[PDB]
Each structure stands twice: as structure tokens, then as C-alpha cells.
């Protein structure tokens, strides 16, 4: 979904694959809803 | 078949363009075409029918050509043109009515109604004028095998399936969990229901999933996805699996959370959409996996706590719905829609001429049992009859 | 009218084909037709309007022919072409409005808007180029009377009617039985209700019949029939027949058993479908008869036995519903649809120019009161205004 | 763009018309056009791509002309013609897929995908054959600015908004008054709900108003306005504004009385409808004002009197609803529909080739956020990509 | 395909006839045909491979013809002939190995392996020498649609199905009545077992029936029918229906009385055989019905009366068997046998070059799951791969 809508560069793709906090937080500050939804779902799964 | 569409198109264009007062300068080409058609035809004797109440007809063409020296068209010309066109028109109508009823498992693409095989012979090939129509164009493409396409508005690809699935059930049917779905025409209305509002489930969350599998791939589908499924949102009395007993269903709608719709193809995933509602797209898909959840509200008022208690009675069953309609799409395979009449023409002809059931199509050509097994043989025969139905409809609507 | 269609078509094809750089070999014939149109028009003065806000515009045509020594085109030719075509375009738009805003019960097919009576003269007959479109084809067919037809997608053949019929009534409205129905546009939704849940009936079975009659015949109709109607499935407060008091309707949907859909024609049965759902067909029908049943469940759980008792309170009323949408169709007469704009353009013109109400159309052309009494005069006028409105739309959308 | 549409149209017409056995007298013009196109193209080298996962291709046109010597086309000629046409078709598909992806805030109308800038040159302007399609006609018109318009069936102009509004609220949520609405695509389903049933109100009447403000003006809209909104007619558990708590909603439908629909424009009123249902028309409107009421039935049966008492519990909340669906319409600007696959093609291409997000279109081209902010630059770019998508889809489906 | 068969046949006849010392009087026609082939081929360039582990080999043909100037062939001629024939043979083998692996649902009869789509052109049709073989003859017949036929020796038409049916069951499995059958390849072995020896049955007789419905119709079948089915004639431990427990089975064989074997066709009876065993015939049948009985011997000796008591233990269960093999047959469609290596060659090619599993053939082409659904698509693909396998076997076995 991300690569489709928010077309992604090679470095960003490699770092998302490696699960890099730098690019993760760059997206979270870019206000990417496709990622904010995933994070809110992680919250709703880490509630209890 | 190309010469049949040529006949139909040049006859329509004759009936339209050739009218008193017009100018020969604009219809000389069509007139040379009509006269070449007359020359190709004259001398050939055809037969038509011999199945069902289709009367057996015999055609013998001996006509005279049309003048070409005039400047403005007069009545003494148009009248002869019409006396000549009506014959070919009823001939083509009878041919299409004879060709829409015949079936075969081997080489359905091959023409039945052997008069049409004769027309498909090599001496009639000189009649082809323009293969402009969508159907005949895709037909020529499939002959010269290439990437095809039919564009559809609200296509009828889902057969009528109104059924449920229970993942926790008892003989008493007082604490159930599961999912209902009605898939019909171009719409799917699905609804996950739990009687206990996820009071015992982990994390106060209950999951629901619905995997629909289409019998043919689609492309560029414009889809409208909305929450709060309608026809699973009122009190109901629903039968059991084995049809023995009945149980009650008093639903109460909540909001879908963590909704995700995945458009897959051959089990691999193509497109996905998470918490996006309204107008979405699917570029290539053969399968639709919906996955949603039911989350007990942590905060609750007196009135709703009166409906979601912590004990077994549970006289209000929490539900979460999803409606999904396919407004438009494109498909390599021929289907039915809410725009085109070809299926209606075929079924009307069969009903009118009392055609017994064949080996391929089910009785009455019920789209449900005709799309529940969309074998390539059925696809070929259906494309054939739809093409000749389009052809007929171009002349006699 | 044929000449008007010819004008609109050659003007469209002029605005389209005559562009910068294109080749004269492609437009020589259209240019001959345009020059002939010019030759035939030049020397005539026309008047348009004089009813409502329409100004009384006088048109004079003094134009020069199109050169023919050129091989390709330049902007210095397209400019003159446009400065000449815009005038004919607005003249055609004004004539089309002047013909949309006039009516007649005597010879409604005959041309009103006397400028058009002039254009129908025998000197203008040299302008007919091609009568290709559906509306003009059917116009010329009906003139030369033949089996015509208009193809529609979701036509508005049902007037808005929301009503009920009670076969067992009481002043307290406590134990009722009957059927409610909403018939609107291209859909019907009909629901048979019983407050007693078929306890006192014979064999625990109650019957329900809905007989719909169409004010115009149809053919090759494609229909979608589904159970469990959606707008007769939730709590309701309905009014009495005499409209004094109100009563309450708490439904519970069950399945239609022994469902039977009979599409008839002057009482002659044509199509009959028994327990078939989804997509279906009707080759020819004027009347529909939907006959279904409410069968008490013999095997009932406690939760539902507590809702269908054997006593008078009856706080949950058994219901059985059917939706029936007509997706496509073919009709010998003209109607309205969800795809085309003829009715919209007509009503928009009339509302914009404040035309008084005539002896034929109702006030504001409310389609319900227009399709209720579909007199042949109204049919002729509606065909005429739809044809000229389609013509106008071919130039100004 | 005109030359792109001309390429696509003459390639379509070459794949259709040019078939073995046809008559050169019918395709001489198209053959001259094709040969002239080949001449104009011979000697140029084009480059295509360079963005996202689109490959970088180089095209070099050096073909041979098509013989004008024959009278009846044979297979040795058709085969060469198709070998020549498939290269052009691949080139046009690749150009369209290069052009649908790029954006610009400065002169979005001015072409991108610089091969297309090159094709916009003055040595290529000799290729234009005819511009008849709706999108290309409106393109040329809006360039030569005039009163244009696109026709739409069931247009998607409302962004998905499912929301409520409470004019009397409490923390317990036991006596509420307010209105709910779902505005999505072509439908608006609104429902005014009062828990007190207008007992403490003056004259036993409570009003509700809904104002919808479109971003682009429409015209000649055909609308279906029905009562008893469906998706606001079953039990619900809805969350507060601030999400703190939830509340129960058990609705009971009543008719809306003294209803009024005002279609406005720049605050001025244009159309007004009183107590009319079924099909209606709106000739021009930028704003819709629905106004309906809830009137307590003065007379009441025992059941409904015991369901609408004069005390605060109020376990059955009175509602009054209205569904409004735009079926057809006409608009000076370009939108999405349920008939055309242009938006679908564009979005599918972007999703396939992983196009980075640009300055104009929103990420992923989500129609909700694309119609909630329809600024002129977005409008122009959307028109451009829709037009080239229509072009690409006239050839490859 | 015809050109491929012609290639293979002339290369076979070249490797055979063209040898040192032979006489030009015998091979003049073959030399003319080979020279015509070399001429038709010289100038073409083919590519073969690219699926799985098949290498992508490009073939370029530029050879010199074979003189016709001598009487007796010398080694200097045969050497050149062989150095050309080995290349042509390897090329044809690679073409066949690329054609045996490509599948399609739509037009499986049409050449895949596009090098062969090229060979199927009209400049290559000059190669056809004689289509004599059974497979190619039936191919030409199915193209010129007519009544075909393939002769088979021991045709594998039955899928492996070992299964029983208990018309009287108990939880302990101590008094059973039923029938077991194994249907495999060309043979059926059926056995009707009763644990009570028909003691409680009327007239001391028990009936047993077995109906096999074939997936394809056979004709002129020769059959060997015998009693005392062997593989169900010794002790056994057989599982239950649901597979939970097991039960013992101690068969004691008797003879079938009132034996009746009916070869039916569409429910009608065609051949009937009563009390006959050994060689029989069946001229046409799609279904076989074997109906036998078990008759208690009235006059029993001590040793046997001590086995079939009048009480519940029943430690010896009476059985009656029937074997039926289909030795030879004729079928309008294609199957597999114990005589022809086409299927083996196909599956070996696929296993060797690691061909993935496609939409049509099951994984590994297991004949059980391939005959259990004999779709027309599967029939066409199977005939195509079998024909080209026969072709490749005519050169390399």
C-alpha cells in the first residue's frame, strides 16, 4: 500500500525493509496515514 | 461472423444514410459496398432453422443492383433500396435466432447453424466493411490472439449466495459468533456478529474474515466500500445448517475497526486498503479478502450497558457490517451487466422458440448456475451468442 | 426534424473534423454537404421565440462557401469555419428550445415552432445527411410505421407510490394482516406482514399477492429479484387508511416460501419463475404478479417461541419482503432513465424560461403525474421534445 | 494531445476497418491518413519513461508505406499493416503511461513527458484526423473557451462524510435532538432524530436542516428523492463527539412533513420542491438545502402512545429520514462516475509503477481528499490525465 | 501442427530411405519434398525456450539443396543429408519440447510456442506431404469437424477409486450388508458382501447393484467379464466411513445368480447381458450397471452349514464378486492406454525441465485428477500435447 500510494525511493525502501527507526520516524513526522493506522492498530493490540 | 456483422452494419447504415433528398457524393462508398454485397450474395441459396419452434426457412437471393448516376435521391430509388434491405434484414434476424440457440462443448467458437459456416466460407469474405463494435472487435482479437478487454458498468459476476458461517455454536443457539454474507449481482453485504459482544474473547476484540473467490479475473474495478451493512441490521429468524430448527438474531450495529480489504489474484496479493472508505480501485484481482473486527466499547452508558451485560441471555447481538459494490470494471471475459440487453435477447429467443435444454447451458440460462461454473466452453458459447445477440439488436431492438 | 438532425450532425462533425493541419481528403464530402446547406439556407429569414422569457430573435443567413483548392488546412480557414458554425449552432439551439416549449393535442407529432414547419419544406429536403441516432431512427421508423424500439438502462416506468392494503383490520390496529409496497423509478419493494405469525391461518400458511400493471408494454427486460426488503424491515409508525390515527409496525423478516413471479400480457402468461433468485428475464410483459407465502416455522427455539406466542399481544410481527429492480429494458415508447439527460434538459429549459403550463404536460412536468396518465398525445409530445432535446445535446451539452 | 487522440483513433480505425477482403474504396482516406502519419513520423527518435518503476524506452520510426494499388485487401497486406500498427500502439500506450504520472502546479495543461511536448510541435500538426470524443471535444473547447460540459451517470461529487450533529445533548445521552448524515459518492442519506418526539416543543413540531455545499457547479441533474433513509433506521451504538463515552440509538421512522428542498446558487435560490418525491430535476445548483420536520401524531393508538410517552426514558427515538441519489448530471468540470474507467486506469498505472507523490494530486489519488479540495490546478491536471486515459482506453482495455 | 508433423515425417523418411547405395528412383519425391522444405525454411529465424529450465536457443536456416543428378546414392550425398537432418531433427525436438509445456484455457487448440504460431502461417503451408497418422488425421477431422475416432488397447479411463457402501450398518460392525468396488485404469472389481447370508431376506436372496458413470463415451468396446473378484476374496481389516475405527471382513465366495450387466447410454439401455461370462461387446455406452445377487444354498453340507448359522455371530461373511476389464475400445476423444508413450513423454518432459503447474492441468498431471474432471479445455490441451508428443516420438523415442 505504501509503495503504491506514497511512491518510495530505494533508500527508504531498504530502510523500511531493515525496519529502520530513522525512516520510520521520518514517515511518522511526514504524517503518513497508511503508517499511523498500522501504529494505532499496534496500540490497540498492545493494550492488553 | 465478421461478414454477418458486416451485413448488419451496412444494412443499418443503409436504412439510416439512404433517405430521400440526400447527396450521392456522401453515400457512393456505401452504395458500392451494398452492390458488392448483392453480387457476392446473388446465386447462393440458404436454409435457416430446424430446432425448437424455429420454422424452417429457405432463402434465395436474386436482386438487381442500385443506380449510381443520380445526384439527389428520389422515392423511386429509396423504395427499391428498402424492398432489397428488408429481405437481408429478416434473413440476418432469422440467422441470429438460429445461431443463438445452438450449443457445443467442442469448439464453441466454431460457428453452428451451418448456413453461417457457409457465410464464413472464403468466397463471402469480400463483404467486410468495418469491425467497429466492441464485441466483434474482441472476437477478431481472440482469433488473432491478443490482449482483449470488455468494459462493464455494474457487472453481474457474483451468483446469489446468501449464507452464514458459525465459528462458535451450540444446540441452544444463545451465544453465537460468526459471519453472514449476501453476495449478489455486483454487491457483497457481509456482517460479523457476536452475541456476547466480545466479553470473553481476548483483549475485548473479535475478528471476522470473508474470502470471496471470483471465477474470472477482473481489472480497473471502481469499487464503493461503505460500513453498516443494511440487510443484516434488523431482527431476523434464521434457519439452522441442516434446515431443522430456527434461531433468532437481534443485531445492534457498531463501527468497524481495523478494517482491511485485500484484492488478490491466484492467491497472491495485488492491492490492499486499510481504513479507506468510499471510492477505491482494484487494478487486477480474482479474490477479495475482507477482514474486520468488533471491539467492545471500554466506556459505556447506562442504556448500552443494559444491552451488553456480562451474563448469558444476550438479547442484543453486537454486529459489524460492510457493503461493497463494483460500479464499473474491465474484464477479458464476457459477462452480464445492468446496461446491455444481449442476455435478455438470448433468453427471450429461447423462451419464445421453446428450445430444450442443451448440454452446456443450464435450463433457462439462469445466470446463477451459469456463472457458478464458468468453464471455458461455457465462456466461448456465451461470447458467441452474446456477439450474435448484439448483432441482431443492432437491427431489431 | 430530419433536417434539424442533419444540421446538428454536420455542425458537430464540422467542429470535430475541421481542425488545423488535417487533410482535405478526409473532409471533402462534409465540406460539399456544408456548402450545400449554405446554398439552401442563404436567402431565408427565420424568427424564433415569443413565448415566455424567450426573446423574438430574427436570423438572417448570408455566408460564403468553403474553398476547395487547399490540400491541408490552416488556422486562417478554421477561423472562418468557426465564425460561420457558431451562428448555425446558436440558431439550432434556439429552434430546439422553441420546439421544446410548445405543445399540441392535435397532431403532436407534426412540427410546432413554425420556423421548424418552414424547415420541413420541400426545398430544405436536400440537407438530409444521415439519420443515424436512436431517436431519429425511431422517428423515421414510426413515420414509416414499423416495429420500433428504445433501449433503456434503469428506466423510470413506476410512478412514486407508497401504500398498503390490509386484508384483516381492527380499529385498534392490533392483529393486522396485509401488504405494504413502495414502487419508485425502476424498483419495487413489497412486504407482506402478519401480526399473528400465521397461527390462526390454515396449515400455518398465509398467502400474499401483489399485482403491478404497467402503463406501457416492455420487452427483453433484465430484472434482479432479491428477498428481505430493506425499507420495510425496521420499526415504523404508519397512518390509518382514513388518515386519522396511527399504528405501530415492529417487523421480523422471514424467508419467502413458494414464491412465484408471473410476468403476464393481457392476462396471457408469458414468463413464470418459481423459487429462482438473482438475475432473471422477461421477453414481453405488461403485468407483474408476485405471489409469496408466510409459513410459520414448525421447529422453533425458545428465543423465537417467546416472540411468536399463541396469544393476542403480538409485539413482533412476521414479515416477508421482496425487492425487484429493472436494470435494463427495451420499449416501443419513450421514457426516462438514470443514464440520459433529455428530460433534464427539457425541464431545465422550461424552468429557466418560465413557460406557462400547457394543455398536455402537468405543472413542472412531474414524472409521476406524467407517467400516471400516459395518453398517446402526451406520448407524441414527449417523443418529439426528447428527440429535439437529444439533437440539441449533440451540439450543446 | 489532439495528435495523441488522432493517433489512437486512426490506429483503432485501422485495426477495425482494415480486414482481408474489404474494399479500398471504403478505407482510402484512412490509408492516406496512415501513410501521412508514417511520413511525418519517419526520421524522429523518441524517448519515454524515467520516473518510478517505468522503464526507459527508445523508439525509432522507420516504416514503409501502405500500397494504394489493390482493390480488395488480402492477408499479405493486412499482416504488414498490423505489424506496423502494433508498434505504434505500444508507443502510444507507453506515452500515455508516461504522461498520466507527471504533475505540475504551473501550466498543468502544458504537456509533460517531453516526447509529448515534441509531438506538440508544428511538424506533427499534420496528423490530426478528427476530434469527436467527449473528453477531447471539451478539451479543445475549454482551450477555445466556451460553454462546455461533461455528462455523468451517478457522479462521485460528494466526499465520504458520515457524521452527526446534536443540538441538545447531555452526559447521560437520554434525551437528544439532532441530525445524522452520510454524504458519499452520488447519495445523501440524512435523518433527523429526536428522543422526546417533539413533546416539549412548540406546536408539537421540531425542525431539521441540512446544507450541502458542492465544490463545483452542476447542471441538468436528475435526482431521486425518497423518504425513510435506510442506513439510519436500525439500532446503533454511537460514540460522543470527543470520544469519551457512547450512547444507544433505537430509531422509529415517521414521515417527514412540510418538507422542502431548495437548490441554490451563490446563495440565491434556483429550484424549490415542496412535498414532492420520486424523480426531480435541478437545472443548476452549487448548494442543496434540505429542510424537514418531525410532527407528533395528534392521534395515537395504545401501542404507539405507550412507545412515545411524556417521560424521560424514551426507549424509542423518533426519526425522519430522506435519501437523495443523483442518477444523471452534467457538469462543466470533470469528475468520476460509475460508467467510465479513466480514474481507474490512472490510479492503476500509478499504483503499478510506484509513482512518487507530487505537488498537485494527493497521495494515491484518493477521491475523497481529491474532491474535498478541487483547486483549479488539480482540476486541470485531472482533466488532462482523464483525457489521456480515455485515449489509452480507446485502444488498450 | 500439420507442418510440424510433415517436418517430422519427411525427416524420418529421410533418415530411413536416404542411405548409401539406394536408388534415386525410390526417393525422387522425397528429395523434391526436402528441397521444397529447405526453400520454404531458408530465410527464417526461430527462437525456442524460456520456460523453466529450457534453454533459449535461436535457430537460423541457411542450407544448400540436394542434387538429383545421380542414380545410386553415394556417401558424399548421404553425409550432407545427415548433417542437415540432424540439425532439423534437433530443431523439431526443441520445438516439441517447447510446445508440450505451454497451457491455455482459451483456444487450447490454437498453436502456443509462438515459433509454431509462425510455422502455422501461409508461407509454410507448402511443406505438407501426408497427414497419415491417426492423431494428425483426427486433428484435421476436428478442424474440418466430422466424426472422429481413436482406437485404444486397455484405455486408462477409470480413476483410481477404492470405496465401499453399506446399506445396513451398525456401530459394532457385526451384521453388515453392502458392496465394495475398486475401479482402476481399464478394470473394475466389485464385490457384494452380506454378513447374514440373506437369512432374513425374502426367498433367501439379497440384491446388489453398482452403477459406474464414465466421463467420456466409448464405442465398439471389447470386455472380459468374470466372476469371483480376486482382490476382495481374502480376509481384510477395513476402516470405517469417517475413518475412526476399523472392522474385520472374512469373505467366503459364492456365485452370482440372476447376474445382469447393462451398458446404457443417457439412461436408455443399449446392451444387456444375462448369465454370460467372458468375452462380451458394447457398441456404445456412457454408463455400466452391474446387478448381481446372493442366493443362500438350500442344500448345504455339514462343513458349509457350520459357516452360515442362523444366529448373530456370523464369523464368515458371504461374498459375490465380479471382475470386468475393458481390453480394447474406441473413443471420439483422447485418453491414455498401456500401449502408447505420449503421456509418458509429456510428463517426463515436464518433470525434467521443472515446468510449473498451470491453470488447467493438475500438479504432475496425475491421471486420476485429470480424468475425474474431463473439461473440454483439458481435452483439447491433452489432445494437443499428445499429438505433438507422437510427433516427437516419430523422431526420438
UniProtKB/Swiss-Prot annotation, chains B, C, D, E:
Region (Interaction with the inner capsid protein VP2): 62-73
Subcellular location(s) per record: Virion
Keywords, comma-separated and alphabetical: Calcium, Capsid protein, Intermediate capsid protein, Metal-binding, Ubl conjugation, Virion, Zinc
Signal peptide bounds: none
Major location (coarse): virion
Sites where the protein binds Ca(2+): 266, 286
GO MF annotation list: host cell surface receptor binding; metal ion binding; structural molecule activity
Binding residues for Zn(2+): 153
Superkingdom of origin: Viruses
A GO cellular component annotation in the UniProt record: viral intermediate capsid
Post-translational modification: The N-terminus is blocked.
Coiled coil ranges: none
GO terms, biological process: fusion of virus membrane with host plasma membrane
Function: Intermediate capsid protein that self assembles to form an icosahedral capsid with a T=13 symmetry, which consists of 230 trimers of VP6, with channels at each of its five-fold vertices. This capsid constitutes the middle concentric layer of the viral mature particle. The innermost VP2 capsid and the intermediate VP6 capsid remain intact following cell entry to protect the dsRNA from degradation and to prevent unfavorable antiviral responses in the host cell during all the replication cycle of the virus.
Subunit organization: Homotrimer. Interacts with the inner capsid protein VP2. Interacts with the outer capsid glycoprotein VP7. Interacts with the outer capsid protein VP5*.
Protein family per UniProt: Belongs to the rotavirus VP6 family.
Other notes: The VP6 trimer contains a zinc ion located at the center of the molecule. The zinc ion is not essential for either trimerization or transcription activity of the DLP. Zinc-depleted VP6 has an increased sensitivity to proteases.
Protein name: Intermediate capsid protein VP6
Originating organism: Rotavirus A (strain RVA/Monkey/United States/RRV/1975/G3P5B[3]) (RV-A)
Native organism taxonomy: Viruses, Riboviria, Orthornavirae, Duplornaviricota, Resentoviricetes
Amino acid at each position: 500500500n505504501l509503495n503504491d500510494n506514497y511512491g518510495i525511493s530505494r533508500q527508504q525502501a531498504f530502510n523500511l525493509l531493515r525496519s529502520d527507526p530513522r525512516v520510520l520516524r521520518e514517515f511518522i513526522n511526514q504524517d503518513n496515514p497508511i503508517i499511523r493506522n498500522r501504529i494505532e492498530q499496534l496500540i490497540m493490540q498492545c493494550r492488553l | 461472423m465478421d461478414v454477418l456483422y458486416s451485413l448488419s452494419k451496412t444494412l443499418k447504415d443503409a436504412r439510416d444514410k439512404i433517405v430521400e433528398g440526400t447527396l450521392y457524393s456522401n453515400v457512393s462508398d456505401l452504395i458500392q459496398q451494398f452492390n458488392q454485397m448483392i453480387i457476392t450474395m446473388n446465386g447462393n441459396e440458404f436454409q435457416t432453422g430446424g430446432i425448437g419452434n424455429l420454422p424452417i426457412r429457405n432463402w434465395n437471393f436474386d436482386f438487381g443492383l442500385l443506380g449510381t448516376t443520380l445526384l439527389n435521391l428520389d422515392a423511386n430509388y429509396v423504395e427499391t433500396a428498402r424492398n432489397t434491405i428488408d429481405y437481408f434484414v429478416d434473413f440476418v434476424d432469422n440467422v441470429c435466432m438460429d445461431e443463438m440457440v445452438r450449443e457445443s462443448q467442442r469448439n464453441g467458437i466454431a460457428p453452428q447453424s451451418d448456413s453461417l459456416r457457409k457465410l464464413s466460407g472464403i468466397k463471402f469474405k469480400r463483404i467486410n466493411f468495418d469491425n467497429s463494435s466492441e464485441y466483434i472487435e474482441n472476437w477478431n482479437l481472440q482469433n488473432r490472439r491478443q490482449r482483449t478487454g470488455f468494459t462493464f458498468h455494474k457487472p453481474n459476476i457474483f451468483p446469489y449466495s446468501a449464507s452464514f458461517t458459525l465459528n462458535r455454536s451450540q444446540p441452544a443457539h444463545d451465544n453465537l459468533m460468526g459471519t453472514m454474507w449476501l453476495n449478489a449481482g455486483s454487491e457483497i453485504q457481509v456482517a460479523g456478529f457476536d452475541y456476547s459482544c466480545a466479553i470473553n474473547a481476548p483483549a475485548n476484540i473479535q475478528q471476522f474474515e470473508h474470502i470471496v473467490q471470483l471465477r474470472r479475473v477482473l481489472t480497473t474495478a471502481t469499487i464503493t466500500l461503505l460500513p453498516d451493512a443494511e440487510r443484516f441490521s434488523f431482527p431476523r429468524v434464521i434457519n439452522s445448517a441442516d434446515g431443522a430448527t430456527t434461531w433468532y438474531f437481534n443485531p445492534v450495529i457498531l463501527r468497524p475497526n481495523n478494517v482491511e480489504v485485500e484484492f488478490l489474484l491466484n492467491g497472491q496479493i495485488i492491492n490492499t486498503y486499510q481504513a479507506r472508505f468510499g471510492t477505491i480501485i482494484a487494478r487486477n484481482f480474482d479474490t477479495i479478502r475482507l477482514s474486520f473486527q468488533l471491539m467492545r466499547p471500554p466506556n459505556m452508558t447506562p442504556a448500552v450497558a443494559a444491552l451488553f451485560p456480562n451474563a448469558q441471555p444476550f438479547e442484543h447481538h453486537a454486529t459489524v457490517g460492510l457493503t461493497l459494490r463494483i460500479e464499473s470494471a474491465v474484464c477479458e471475459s464476457v459477462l452480464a451487466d445492468a446496461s446491455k440487453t444481449m442476455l435478455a435477447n438470448v433468453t427471450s429467443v429461447r423462451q419464445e422458440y421453446a428450445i430444450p435444454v442443451g448440454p452446456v447451458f443450464p435450463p433457462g440460462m439462469n445466470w446463477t448456475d451459469l456463472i457458478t461454473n464458468y468453464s471455458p466452453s461455457r465462456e466461448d458459447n456465451l461470447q458467441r451468442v452474446f456477439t450474435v445477440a448484439s448483432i441482431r439488436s443492432m437491427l431489431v431492438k
